[PDB]
């Protein structure tokens, strides 16, 4: 239910970028007239593509990843403890030593 929303957003972005690339290729070939301003803006769009590849961003991203990993670990432990309680309860009434 979440990856499908992500998929739709990415597909819309992909459609827009594909249309822009098709226009750029058509301008290169000759079907559409050479529009200098549009191609300049396409160049500016391409020059911004590596969005924020700095070291501080990488450190912050790694911090976020480790925080989510720890939050997953604490809670995987909880699910395992719940299953452990369930198994102990089911085992006690069967192998009761009375």
């Amino acid at each position: 239910e979440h990856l499908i929303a992500q998929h739709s957003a990415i597909k819309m972005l992909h459609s827009r970028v594909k249309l822009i690339l098709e226009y750029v290729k058509a301008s290169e070939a000759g079907e559409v007239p050479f529009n200098h301003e549009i191609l300049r803006e396409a160049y500016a769009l391409c020059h911004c593509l590596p969005v924020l590849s700095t070291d501080k961003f990488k450190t912050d991203f790694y911090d976020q990843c480790n925080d989510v990993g720890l939050m997953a670990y604490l809670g995987t432990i909880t699910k395992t403890c719940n299953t452990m309680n369930q198994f102990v309860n089911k085992f006690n009434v069967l192998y009761d030593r009375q």
Partner: protein, 57 residues
Amino acid sequence: GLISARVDSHSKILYARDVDQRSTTFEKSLLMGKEFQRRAKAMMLRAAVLRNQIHVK
């Protein structure tokens, strides 16, 4: 005691030590996971020795 500091015996200066909150939680959570898994394995073997009814007679 209540003092959280580190004595520097070279220049004779008592520096105050502040713990890092993020690293402390990671150390404790990983330690708890290691202890919990050890307890789980020991209990698992205990279940086997109880079902088999093993004792020293």
